[PDB]
Amino acid sequence: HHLVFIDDGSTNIKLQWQESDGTIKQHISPNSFKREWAVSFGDKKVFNYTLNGEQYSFDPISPDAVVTTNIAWQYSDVNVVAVHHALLTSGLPVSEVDIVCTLPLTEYYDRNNQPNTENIERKKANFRKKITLNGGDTFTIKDVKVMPESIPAGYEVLQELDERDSLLIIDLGGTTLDISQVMGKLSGISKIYGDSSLGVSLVTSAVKDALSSYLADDIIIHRKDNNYLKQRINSIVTEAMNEALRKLEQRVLNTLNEFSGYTHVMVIGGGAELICDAVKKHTQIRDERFFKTNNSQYDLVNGMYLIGN
Amino acid sequence: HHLVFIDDGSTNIKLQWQESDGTIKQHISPNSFKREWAVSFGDKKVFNYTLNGEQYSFDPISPDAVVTTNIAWQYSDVNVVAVHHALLTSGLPVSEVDIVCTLPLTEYYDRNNQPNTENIERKKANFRKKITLNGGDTFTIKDVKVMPESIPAGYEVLQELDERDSLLIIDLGGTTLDISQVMGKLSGISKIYGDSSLGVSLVTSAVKDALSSYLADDIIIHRKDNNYLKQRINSIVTEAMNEALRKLEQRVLNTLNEFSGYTHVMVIGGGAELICDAVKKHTQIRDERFFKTNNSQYDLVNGMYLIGN
Ligand SMILES: Nc1ncnc2c1ncn2[C@@H]1O[C@H](COP(=O)(O)OP(=O)(O)NP(=O)(O)O)[C@@H](O)[C@H]1O
Ligand SMILES: Nc1ncnc2c1ncn2[C@@H]1O[C@H](COP(=O)(O)OP(=O)(O)NP(=O)(O)O)[C@@H](O)[C@H]1O
Ligand SMILES: [Mg+2]
Ligand SMILES: [Mg+2]
């Protein structure tokens, strides 16, 4: 079977898997689905699913998309649809697959930092829900393993740490800021933290107000090039973005005040690039001990792959 | 002992209690504390606390206030400080008190909608942490009981419902939208929902951007009076607020699509007035079965009082 590692996040589903020839592929797919089939009169291609006697369709523009920011989204029908759609648009041949998926830190672990067995099993069972697609066959999910978010992204680093050092893993997602503090060699977890009131979406929504999702996203990724901005549009948007970024940074730095005793720091998630500078400065962590990739939104799923593949 | 009912929310702490003479009092106190004593050279009055060998002070203006939007805030040192400060500014005489406090729906209950016993006990034990105040004595918390959020606010109504009807309780807080669907006579809970990516703060922050916290709060509460706006300031702020409100409404209505089979609807929390209209319209719930007070931010703590007092 193909083995697919899946970071099913509330913004995008990230996939990683190894091809027959040993080539490693990554994939990303939005999770925007409405609880209704999409109608095409001939122009658009549509992905119309049925899950539990309910219609779903991929829809990246309707405002009536199903919410994905609630806690129980991890165990929802629409999550299952989102994962099947990701598989279906990945380029993998339709087939039986084993998967490894994630639960957010505060779902994977209980408030005593021990694995939450009931949540883990609920996550596995969710993918037994049966799905159909109009005008095509669907992947068949077989074995399901569950990992926590965060930890796998830091594991390659954790292997190099003294059992006594501890890595601070800072994950700024689209809708959440989650942080773990983990003992070297993954000998234990000293602290877990989850705050769903801040994510990249703060900045995206701010920019959007000053003014699709793409325009704002493009404006943000190209904030360092003045000609792109002037070109892409027709000074206000700019100030708004900088204030959003400023407020984002302020709150992230506030959050870090909840942690101490860490010797190493790593920043992951799609928002890593937006707070990287402010986090390095504030932590005063000597650079050899500060970790950030150039593909931050895939750090988790890559770490999962290196562990479980 | 005085018995104090406490809704310790991430924005404000709400208190309710009965006086010796049977008079019912309510109180509200912000939860903004920095992990450091506040310095007064003679002008300001300061509340400087020590919790676990750590300094805290009430601070409604410094940006470095301790975060209160993370999940574990319910079990934090700073929560304990916030509750003692609320008591201390309530007008109650300093003394030994029994209290009833709340856990959010998704902390009080596990993902199988059964009471989470470990979380409940962790909440009780939190108030055993010892606290001191500079230049004054602190209340002594004795017995602690814990109720869930939401349910108590709807209980007076639930008593009147057929065991077969079900009340949809919609709680828009400062940082969270939580919803329960409860069988009449509190015979059971059919569904629990928690989304921490939306709250009144969306609107408050939007207004603030268009431009203290008060100015934005005042602008919002008086959005229906054009002279107040013109007077309070020096058209932009207006459009921004209306777009924030519009987006708020859109997402709340999206959330309601996750629920069905309810015969009654109730809207509570500080944000109830901001979505009341859109919720009544969208639900198409006949008015005798739609419940909203004129003191929405105290609905929970009042319901707790009526139950436990
Ligand atoms: N280099 C970058 N600069 C700016 N934004 C980025 C960058 N890379 C990714 N993003 C965006 O950051 C957002 C968050 O990405 P991501 O962390 O993968 O979301 P998520 O995992 O699905 N959300 P969550 O459930 O809260 O953890 C997305 O909208 C990305 O497009
Ligand atoms: N009638 C009103 N109109 C507009 N805003 C209001 C009104 N009443 C209260 N608010 C505000 O709404 C916000 C949310 O209040 P509240 O629901 O009590 O917060 P909370 O319980 O502490 N937050 P949370 O932990 O997310 O549940 C506060 O900032 C209030 O000031
Ligand atoms: Mg993520
Ligand atoms: Mg509340």
XYZ file of C-alpha atoms and ligand atoms in Angstrom:
682
model
C 0.000 0.000 0.000
C 0.995 3.622 -0.422
C 1.525 5.171 3.017
C 0.370 8.787 3.195
C 1.296 11.174 5.994
C -1.388 13.774 6.590
C -1.393 17.048 8.477
C -5.107 17.786 8.353
C -5.040 21.398 9.501
C -8.008 23.732 9.785
C -6.683 25.886 6.925
C -4.966 23.439 4.536
C -4.480 19.691 4.381
C -0.785 18.884 3.883
C 0.229 15.505 2.427
C 3.573 13.714 2.093
C 4.338 10.268 0.698
C 7.056 8.273 -1.059
C 6.604 7.142 -4.668
C 7.389 3.630 -5.939
C 10.799 4.910 -7.054
C 11.648 6.423 -3.663
C 10.829 9.986 -4.685
C 9.225 12.018 -1.885
C 6.183 14.101 -2.826
C 4.308 16.786 -0.905
C 0.834 18.159 -1.604
C -1.519 20.801 -0.210
C -5.266 21.136 -0.550
C -7.637 23.721 0.936
C -10.366 22.596 3.311
C -13.301 24.563 2.079
C -16.378 22.419 1.512
C -20.062 23.306 1.477
C -22.669 20.807 2.656
C -24.231 20.723 -0.803
C -23.351 19.530 -4.294
C -21.871 22.127 -6.635
C -23.718 22.613 -9.924
C -21.815 22.770 -13.190
C -23.635 23.570 -16.409
C -20.530 22.701 -18.433
C -17.761 25.139 -17.488
C -16.485 24.239 -13.998
C -15.160 20.858 -12.843
C -16.791 19.827 -9.584
C -16.027 17.375 -6.788
C -19.345 16.205 -5.363
C -19.177 13.843 -2.398
C -21.635 11.944 -0.257
C -20.525 11.040 3.274
C -23.267 9.997 5.705
C -26.221 10.506 3.390
C -25.090 14.137 3.217
C -23.883 16.055 0.156
C -20.568 17.861 0.175
C -18.624 19.645 -2.534
C -15.292 21.385 -2.747
C -15.960 25.142 -2.740
C -13.173 27.752 -2.357
C -15.351 30.837 -2.826
C -18.822 30.433 -1.316
C -19.126 32.088 2.101
C -21.313 29.192 3.299
C -18.376 26.786 3.571
C -18.552 24.431 6.536
C -16.707 25.778 9.575
C -13.335 24.114 10.289
C -12.191 26.103 13.346
C -14.197 24.287 16.020
C -12.533 21.712 18.249
C -14.568 18.749 17.020
C -13.676 19.413 13.373
C -10.943 16.770 13.894
C -13.707 14.170 14.319
C -16.191 15.549 11.778
C -17.705 14.204 8.567
C -16.346 17.173 6.645
C -12.791 16.437 7.819
C -13.102 12.989 6.206
C -14.253 14.620 2.964
C -11.339 17.085 3.097
C -8.820 14.255 3.436
C -10.300 12.248 0.548
C -10.285 15.353 -1.646
C -6.620 15.971 -0.813
C -5.798 12.416 -1.811
C -7.888 12.760 -4.982
C -6.089 15.920 -6.111
C -2.627 14.696 -5.076
C -1.792 12.814 -8.279
C -1.606 9.500 -6.457
C -3.496 6.777 -8.298
C -6.831 6.023 -6.653
C -6.311 2.988 -4.438
C -6.210 1.509 -0.967
C -4.003 3.559 1.331
C -2.676 3.478 4.852
C -2.404 6.906 6.447
C -0.834 8.690 9.380
C -2.799 11.728 10.568
C -2.452 14.245 13.406
C -4.371 15.534 16.394
C -3.637 19.002 17.790
C -1.561 18.969 20.983
C -4.467 19.653 23.329
C -6.577 16.927 21.683
C -3.813 14.313 21.473
C -2.853 14.935 25.105
C -5.056 15.551 28.110
C -4.443 18.352 30.634
C -1.991 16.079 32.460
C 0.103 15.779 29.269
C -0.733 12.088 28.830
C -2.013 10.714 25.507
C -5.803 11.000 25.315
C -6.670 7.457 24.270
C -10.364 8.112 23.627
C -9.601 11.045 21.316
C -6.973 9.027 19.473
C -9.423 6.169 18.853
C -12.187 8.596 17.864
C -9.792 10.062 15.287
C -8.989 6.621 13.845
C -12.659 5.590 13.674
C -13.585 8.805 11.854
C -11.850 7.554 8.703
C -14.075 4.459 8.618
C -16.937 6.681 7.487
C -17.802 5.705 3.932
C -17.611 8.246 1.120
C -18.597 8.395 -2.557
C -17.600 10.750 -5.379
C -19.687 11.627 -8.447
C -17.981 10.473 -11.650
C -14.945 8.815 -10.124
C -13.783 6.296 -7.543
C -12.522 7.215 -4.077
C -9.416 6.111 -2.211
C -9.965 3.393 0.365
C -8.438 4.250 3.720
C -7.168 1.124 5.478
C -4.774 1.436 8.435
C -4.839 4.698 10.397
C -2.154 5.821 12.815
C -2.329 9.068 14.771
C 0.521 11.309 15.873
C 0.378 14.568 17.813
C 1.055 17.845 16.043
C 4.277 19.727 16.897
C 6.433 16.929 18.299
C 7.145 15.186 14.980
C 8.332 18.470 13.416
C 10.929 18.839 16.144
C 11.947 15.191 16.361
C 14.955 15.291 14.035
C 16.325 18.059 16.267
C 15.238 16.374 19.492
C 17.414 13.389 18.614
C 20.517 15.600 18.940
C 19.653 17.189 22.299
C 20.856 16.198 25.753
C 18.037 14.524 27.683
C 18.228 17.600 29.866
C 17.965 20.281 27.220
C 14.489 21.162 25.988
C 13.208 22.338 22.635
C 10.539 25.023 22.438
C 8.398 24.234 19.397
C 6.371 27.255 18.242
C 3.652 26.528 15.692
C 1.770 29.502 14.282
C -1.050 28.109 12.158
C -3.863 29.748 10.240
C -6.212 29.816 13.220
C -4.104 28.638 16.184
C -0.840 29.187 18.024
C 0.278 25.943 19.628
C 3.486 25.461 21.578
C 5.174 22.436 23.112
C 8.260 22.286 25.316
C 9.948 18.932 24.900
C 12.880 17.261 26.703
C 15.846 16.240 24.561
C 15.686 12.831 22.888
C 11.913 13.101 23.374
C 12.403 11.864 26.943
C 9.271 13.780 27.964
C 7.036 16.814 27.509
C 7.361 19.554 30.093
C 4.565 21.809 28.826
C 1.806 21.947 26.202
C 0.020 25.091 25.113
C -2.863 25.889 22.770
C -4.434 29.249 21.921
C -7.008 29.339 19.131
C -7.559 33.110 19.182
C -4.465 33.874 17.092
C -3.185 32.698 13.752
C -2.135 34.015 10.359
C -5.843 34.651 9.700
C -5.608 37.771 11.896
C -3.277 39.316 9.316
C -5.118 37.971 6.289
C -8.445 39.336 7.542
C -6.884 42.727 8.395
C -5.427 43.149 4.912
C -8.733 41.999 3.365
C -10.541 44.699 5.350
C -8.158 47.441 4.214
C -9.192 46.490 0.676
C -9.829 37.182 -3.258
C -8.198 35.487 -0.287
C -5.341 35.275 -2.785
C -4.963 39.031 -3.188
C -4.420 39.417 0.574
C -2.203 36.311 0.736
C -0.092 37.617 -2.174
C 0.100 41.055 -0.593
C 1.450 39.476 2.603
C 4.030 37.152 1.030
C 5.304 40.056 -1.103
C 5.250 42.736 1.607
C 9.009 43.172 1.175
C 8.732 44.315 -2.453
C 7.187 47.743 -2.979
C 6.797 47.449 -6.758
C 4.759 44.250 -6.466
C 2.315 45.989 -4.152
C 1.966 49.101 -6.310
C 1.621 46.838 -9.335
C -0.727 44.234 -7.849
C -3.230 46.957 -6.927
C -4.199 50.619 -7.451
C -0.356 52.854 1.185
C -3.477 52.199 3.255
C -3.428 48.430 2.823
C 0.269 48.712 3.713
C -0.179 50.451 7.074
C -2.999 48.064 7.951
C -0.805 45.029 7.259
C 2.062 46.421 9.333
C -0.243 47.049 12.277
C -1.691 43.545 12.016
C 1.828 42.094 11.868
C 2.808 44.320 14.785
C -0.145 43.147 16.879
C 0.516 39.548 15.857
C 4.111 39.813 17.022
C 3.123 41.483 20.304
C 0.719 38.675 21.233
C 3.097 35.886 20.250
C 5.848 37.458 22.383
C 3.335 37.735 25.233
C 2.622 34.034 24.890
C 6.313 33.101 25.143
C 6.327 34.679 28.606
C 4.423 31.549 29.695
C 7.531 29.423 29.033
C 11.002 29.228 30.549
C 13.942 26.834 30.920
C 14.191 26.001 27.216
C 17.608 25.805 25.565
C 16.476 25.470 21.945
C 13.733 27.122 19.883
C 12.030 26.070 16.662
C 9.354 27.886 14.679
C 6.968 25.983 12.378
C 3.588 26.284 10.652
C 2.555 28.617 7.842
C 2.999 31.681 10.030
C 6.598 30.915 11.003
C 7.999 33.488 8.591
C 5.751 36.231 10.030
C 7.118 35.941 13.578
C 10.570 34.392 13.014
C 12.472 37.658 13.579
C 10.534 38.758 16.681
C 10.860 35.306 18.248
C 14.618 35.080 17.754
C 15.109 38.564 19.196
C 12.827 38.074 22.205
C 14.113 34.602 23.152
C 17.753 35.696 22.868
C 18.489 32.140 21.766
C 21.960 31.714 20.291
C 21.572 31.080 16.565
C 22.978 27.530 16.486
C 20.017 26.634 18.686
C 17.290 28.376 16.671
C 15.579 26.290 14.006
C 13.438 27.405 11.086
C 13.131 25.896 7.606
C 12.132 27.555 4.323
C 9.109 25.270 3.925
C 7.546 25.844 7.352
C 3.997 24.803 6.450
C 5.282 21.259 5.724
C 7.589 20.866 8.767
C 5.050 18.739 10.607
C 4.116 16.369 7.794
C 7.783 15.966 6.857
C 8.674 15.092 10.442
C 5.842 12.568 10.502
C 7.161 11.011 7.314
C 10.705 10.704 8.673
C 9.352 8.937 11.758
C 6.690 6.631 10.400
C 7.736 5.930 6.808
C -20.186 31.913 54.650
C -21.002 34.152 51.716
C -21.550 31.995 48.624
C -20.235 33.614 45.449
C -21.124 32.450 41.950
C -18.338 33.126 39.478
C -18.232 33.153 35.700
C -14.487 33.462 35.226
C -14.417 34.300 31.529
C -11.353 35.096 29.453
C -12.501 38.710 29.009
C -14.265 39.613 32.283
C -14.920 37.876 35.579
C -18.633 38.068 36.429
C -19.763 37.663 40.051
C -23.176 37.200 41.676
C -24.063 36.698 45.332
C -26.823 37.330 47.869
C -26.328 39.848 50.685
C -27.240 39.206 54.334
C -30.558 40.971 53.706
C -31.424 38.852 50.662
C -30.416 41.494 48.130
C -28.794 40.033 45.003
C -25.635 41.756 43.764
C -23.690 41.370 40.527
C -20.138 42.506 39.790
C -17.704 42.530 36.869
C -13.937 42.819 36.852
C -11.490 42.735 33.934
C -8.880 39.994 33.773
C -5.826 41.914 32.779
C -2.837 41.177 34.995
C 0.883 41.485 34.346
C 3.341 39.086 35.971
C 4.988 41.953 37.837
C 4.147 44.400 40.610
C 2.850 47.798 39.518
C 4.804 50.792 40.814
C 2.997 53.774 42.283
C 4.937 56.869 43.272
C 1.849 58.317 44.964
C -0.828 58.862 42.311
C -2.236 55.459 41.285
C -3.746 52.817 43.579
C -2.250 49.412 42.860
C -3.201 45.799 43.537
C 0.021 43.827 43.911
C -0.335 40.087 44.441
C 1.976 37.168 45.058
C 0.733 33.720 44.019
C 3.358 30.971 43.759
C 6.393 33.087 44.572
C 5.435 35.122 41.500
C 4.400 38.785 41.365
C 1.172 39.834 39.711
C -0.615 43.159 39.494
C -3.856 44.376 38.015
C -3.016 46.236 34.791
C -5.689 47.353 32.274
C -3.359 49.215 29.910
C 0.049 47.549 29.586
C 0.338 45.426 26.436
C 2.357 42.830 28.384
C -0.695 41.516 30.241
C -0.705 37.763 30.775
C -2.566 35.909 28.026
C -6.029 34.610 29.009
C -7.161 33.032 25.716
C -5.312 29.718 25.980
C -7.151 26.573 27.026
C -5.223 26.041 30.256
C -5.987 29.562 31.507
C -8.852 27.903 33.448
C -6.224 26.097 35.547
C -3.612 28.868 35.712
C -2.077 30.886 38.537
C -3.247 34.105 36.916
C -6.862 32.886 36.862
C -6.668 32.521 40.658
C -5.357 36.085 40.925
C -8.157 37.350 38.656
C -10.812 35.745 40.857
C -9.350 37.151 44.088
C -9.164 40.612 42.523
C -12.817 40.374 41.473
C -13.776 39.477 45.020
C -11.589 42.287 46.384
C -13.209 44.939 44.185
C -16.751 43.589 44.625
C -17.586 45.437 47.846
C -17.974 42.202 49.775
C -16.163 42.326 53.104
C -12.911 40.374 53.009
C -13.629 36.956 54.489
C -13.890 33.222 54.004
C -16.060 32.379 51.014
C -17.482 29.365 49.265
C -17.637 29.733 45.496
C -19.201 28.180 42.432
C -17.129 28.599 39.263
C -17.434 27.441 35.647
C -15.538 25.427 33.074
C -16.147 26.010 29.359
C -18.306 23.338 27.715
C -15.435 21.527 26.014
C -13.411 21.472 29.253
C -16.286 20.459 31.539
C -17.312 17.688 29.138
C -15.163 15.308 27.144
C -15.712 14.576 23.435
C -18.314 11.967 24.404
C -20.335 14.662 26.224
C -19.658 13.138 29.649
C -18.356 15.248 32.550
C -14.553 15.383 32.501
C -13.823 14.455 36.107
C -10.087 15.169 35.966
C -10.652 18.677 34.588
C -13.321 19.368 37.192
C -10.990 18.346 40.033
C -8.092 20.296 38.516
C -10.348 23.368 38.494
C -11.270 22.910 42.168
C -7.649 22.367 43.241
C -6.528 25.516 41.417
C -8.235 27.681 44.044
C -6.153 26.089 46.814
C -3.163 28.053 45.547
C -2.251 30.584 48.212
C -2.249 34.300 47.441
C -1.161 37.498 49.201
C -1.973 41.166 48.574
C 0.233 44.157 49.427
C -1.440 46.413 52.000
C -4.588 44.400 52.575
C -5.933 40.958 53.408
C -7.241 38.493 50.827
C -10.444 36.471 50.752
C -10.089 32.852 51.804
C -11.663 30.464 49.326
C -13.121 27.428 51.096
C -15.576 25.149 49.266
C -15.412 25.102 45.463
C -18.106 23.709 43.199
C -17.833 23.655 39.415
C -20.604 23.969 36.850
C -20.363 23.936 33.062
C -20.841 27.148 31.117
C -23.994 27.511 28.977
C -26.312 24.989 30.621
C -27.016 27.002 33.786
C -28.009 30.064 31.716
C -30.657 28.019 29.948
C -31.848 26.037 32.955
C -34.785 28.230 33.967
C -36.085 27.768 30.415
C -35.162 24.087 30.263
C -37.450 23.436 33.223
C -40.455 24.416 31.070
C -39.607 22.283 28.022
C -40.946 18.862 27.095
C -38.259 16.223 27.634
C -38.365 15.904 23.873
C -37.909 19.526 22.909
C -34.365 20.873 22.866
C -32.943 24.297 23.585
C -30.149 25.699 21.441
C -27.967 27.824 23.718
C -25.772 30.251 21.753
C -23.023 31.956 23.742
C -20.970 34.587 21.944
C -18.162 35.583 24.294
C -15.227 37.935 23.927
C -12.956 35.292 22.421
C -15.194 32.239 21.880
C -18.477 31.082 20.388
C -19.785 28.112 22.343
C -23.063 26.337 21.685
C -24.928 23.565 23.470
C -28.075 21.732 22.402
C -29.905 20.474 25.459
C -32.957 18.212 25.908
C -35.909 19.679 27.795
C -35.863 19.392 31.584
C -32.096 18.935 31.206
C -32.736 15.257 30.451
C -29.547 15.200 28.365
C -27.164 17.022 26.040
C -27.430 16.193 22.361
C -24.500 18.295 21.133
C -21.670 20.499 22.416
C -19.712 22.943 20.306
C -16.735 25.232 20.881
C -14.988 27.589 18.456
C -12.340 29.920 19.860
C -11.617 31.755 16.598
C -14.616 34.085 16.916
C -15.861 36.429 19.588
C -16.759 40.067 20.144
C -13.008 40.784 20.028
C -13.158 40.479 16.220
C -15.346 43.590 16.134
C -13.489 45.435 18.875
C -10.138 44.890 17.152
C -11.562 45.940 13.755
C -12.905 49.223 15.118
C -9.617 49.822 16.979
C -7.738 49.392 13.695
C -9.961 51.865 11.844
C -8.880 54.387 14.484
C -8.569 53.047 24.514
C -10.354 49.705 24.428
C -13.152 51.883 25.800
C -13.345 54.145 22.757
C -13.968 51.123 20.505
C -16.330 49.516 23.041
C -18.301 52.782 23.334
C -18.376 53.164 19.564
C -19.881 49.674 19.271
C -22.523 49.975 22.003
C -23.605 53.339 20.546
C -23.499 52.355 16.866
C -27.221 53.121 16.609
C -26.796 56.812 17.469
C -25.081 58.925 14.822
C -24.605 62.016 17.000
C -22.726 60.055 19.662
C -20.266 58.826 17.056
C -19.717 62.241 15.477
C -19.397 63.690 18.968
C -17.212 60.986 20.522
C -14.611 61.451 17.774
C -13.460 63.707 14.908
C -17.423 57.570 8.507
C -14.392 55.312 8.106
C -14.603 53.782 11.571
C -18.305 53.329 10.780
C -17.866 51.289 7.590
C -15.183 49.198 9.278
C -17.496 48.363 12.187
C -20.349 47.410 9.861
C -18.097 45.083 7.889
C -16.805 43.472 11.080
C -20.383 43.029 12.312
C -21.335 41.684 8.890
C -18.497 39.151 8.918
C -19.295 38.245 12.521
C -22.904 37.541 11.608
C -21.927 35.510 8.532
C -19.681 33.180 10.544
C -22.158 32.729 13.383
C -24.889 31.811 10.876
C -22.442 29.379 9.260
C -21.892 27.772 12.642
C -25.627 27.254 13.221
C -25.659 25.067 10.107
C -23.932 22.459 12.302
C -27.116 22.099 14.388
C -30.631 20.855 13.696
C -33.688 19.461 15.494
C -33.877 22.245 18.081
C -37.254 23.726 18.996
C -36.044 26.624 21.148
C -33.174 29.110 20.841
C -31.437 31.276 23.424
C -28.628 33.778 22.935
C -26.272 34.690 25.803
C -22.838 36.173 26.507
C -21.624 39.726 25.947
C -21.984 39.408 22.187
C -25.639 38.349 22.259
C -26.855 41.792 21.225
C -24.522 41.834 18.192
C -25.995 38.692 16.609
C -29.498 38.555 18.139
C -31.261 39.805 14.988
C -29.357 37.598 12.519
C -29.884 34.519 14.692
C -33.634 35.004 15.038
C -34.002 35.544 11.292
C -31.825 32.598 10.251
C -33.294 30.088 12.729
C -36.871 31.052 11.834
C -37.741 30.241 15.437
C -41.188 31.457 16.460
C -40.732 34.330 18.903
C -42.297 32.670 21.965
C -39.440 30.185 21.702
C -36.583 32.675 21.293
C -34.900 33.839 24.487
C -32.633 36.821 25.061
C -32.304 39.043 28.132
C -31.144 42.664 28.391
C -28.220 41.714 30.643
C -26.724 38.978 28.453
C -23.204 39.066 29.901
C -24.631 37.961 33.289
C -27.034 35.246 32.025
C -24.645 32.469 32.994
C -23.747 33.653 36.485
C -27.403 34.426 37.211
C -28.427 30.937 36.125
C -25.717 29.479 38.345
C -27.022 31.501 41.267
C -30.612 30.339 40.749
C -29.424 26.725 40.745
C -26.836 26.608 43.491
C -27.818 29.398 45.887
N 6.021 31.694 3.950
C 4.721 32.146 4.312
N 4.447 33.447 4.558
C 3.225 33.874 4.900
N 2.191 33.063 5.029
C 2.329 31.742 4.813
C 3.641 31.217 4.436
N 3.521 29.801 4.274
C 2.219 29.490 4.525
N 1.475 30.623 4.847
C 0.067 30.670 5.205
O -0.081 30.521 6.595
C -1.401 29.975 6.824
C -1.302 28.913 7.856
O -0.789 27.732 7.295
P -0.912 26.364 8.120
O -0.020 26.424 9.312
O -0.406 25.208 7.306
O -2.422 26.235 8.486
P -3.127 25.064 9.261
O -2.165 24.008 9.705
O -4.089 24.328 8.337
N -4.026 25.835 10.471
P -4.173 25.234 12.000
O -5.234 24.189 12.232
O -4.556 26.372 12.921
O -2.967 24.668 12.634
C -1.925 29.555 5.490
O -2.987 30.397 5.078
C -0.750 29.601 4.582
O -1.061 29.932 3.288
N -24.840 44.794 25.175
C -23.531 44.651 24.636
N -23.204 45.083 23.397
C -21.973 44.948 22.889
N -20.981 44.379 23.550
C -21.174 43.905 24.794
C -22.499 44.025 25.402
N -22.440 43.444 26.708
C -21.161 43.010 26.884
N -20.374 43.270 25.764
C -18.975 42.921 25.579
O -18.871 41.640 25.007
C -17.584 41.107 25.397
C -17.759 39.686 25.787
O -18.311 39.596 27.076
P -18.274 38.189 27.839
O -19.193 37.232 27.160
O -18.811 38.330 29.235
O -16.782 37.739 27.806
P -16.152 36.446 28.441
O -17.173 35.575 29.101
O -15.200 36.826 29.568
N -15.250 35.751 27.187
P -15.172 34.123 26.935
O -14.167 33.346 27.746
O -14.761 33.887 25.498
O -16.419 33.347 27.069
C -17.045 42.020 26.448
O -15.935 42.751 25.960
C -18.192 42.881 26.837
O -17.832 44.148 27.216
Mg -1.371 23.427 11.662
Mg -18.045 33.631 28.590
